[PDB]
Design an enzyme around this catalytic site. Structure first.
Site: not given
Length: 241
Positions: A43, A89, A183
């Site tokens: 992402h 992801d 992240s």
């Protein structure tokens, strides 16, 4: 324990600050996976490239808009974007060598996925200084119960939303400050061995504070299996040879 603490400080030299300025500007965490290859979340690449761009051009845009610092001390990445996956992801990028030493790779074999206990996360919350944090694993069997407890406590002042972590042994769940923009941060077990990559949480705003119901990251075991199945020739040149 301090031998693990000294180990995590050494490992943190392999955790990078990824910054981009494209149609938008932002930051994430990444880390050296194997050799010149780094890992971050898929992402994050979507935020760099944005929407409505043909796939033939992502590699050029990534090569033109991404820089990585592990600390002029920075690395560009190669205009190359082939190993990645939306559900797990993750995205692999390749650093471009520039005479600076590339930090040691963090993938060090088949770490067991901790089902409970303590894990460690290394990265850049708030896009500020690098931090090493200790978090308690939330076991799979308590994930759905934990989510409903905390939603109801707040409503006191459903589970279709959380049903991407409920029966997913491919993730570890936990509560961490790294929810705040870190992240891509690698996650280690209690011995300091790489086990996962922090992915996301479940954001909401409460009393003007951004908070998260629960956080999770995808296991290295699941990522490596995906690479093994989908990109066997690449796996063998990079990991075996």
């Amino acid at each position: 324990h301090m031998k693990v603490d000294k180990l995590l400080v050494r490992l943190s030299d392999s955790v990078g600050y990824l910054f981009w300025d494209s149609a938008t500007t932002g930051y994430a965490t990444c880390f050296v996976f194997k050799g010149l290859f780094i890992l971050t979340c898929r992402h994050v690449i979507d935020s760099i490239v944005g929407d409505g761009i043909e796939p033939s051009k992502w590699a050029t845009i990534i090569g033109q808009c991404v820089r990585v610092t592990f600390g002029t001390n920075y690395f560009f990445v190669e205009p190359w974007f082939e190993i990645h996956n939306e559900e797990l992801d993750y995205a692999v990028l390749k650093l471009k060598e520039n005479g600076q030493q590339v930090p040691m790779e963090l993938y060090n074999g088949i770490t067991p996925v901790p089902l409970s206990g303590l894990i460690h996360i290394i990265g850049h919350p708030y896009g500020e200084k690098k931090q090493i944090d200790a978090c308690a694993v939330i076991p799979q069997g308590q994930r759905a119960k934990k989510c409903q407890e905390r939603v109801q406590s707040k409503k006191a002042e459903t589970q279709r939303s959380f049903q991407k972590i409920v029966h997913n042994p491919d993730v570890i769940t936990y509560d961490t400050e790294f929810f705040f923009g870190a992240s891509g941060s690698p996650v280690f077990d209690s011995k300091g061995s790489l086990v996962a990559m922090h992915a996301a949480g479940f954001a909401y705003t409460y009393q003007n504070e951004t908070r998260s119901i629960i956080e999770f990251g995808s296991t290295m075991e699941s990522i490596l299996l995906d690479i093994k199945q989908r990109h066997k020739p690449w796996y063998e040149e990079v990991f075996v040879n």
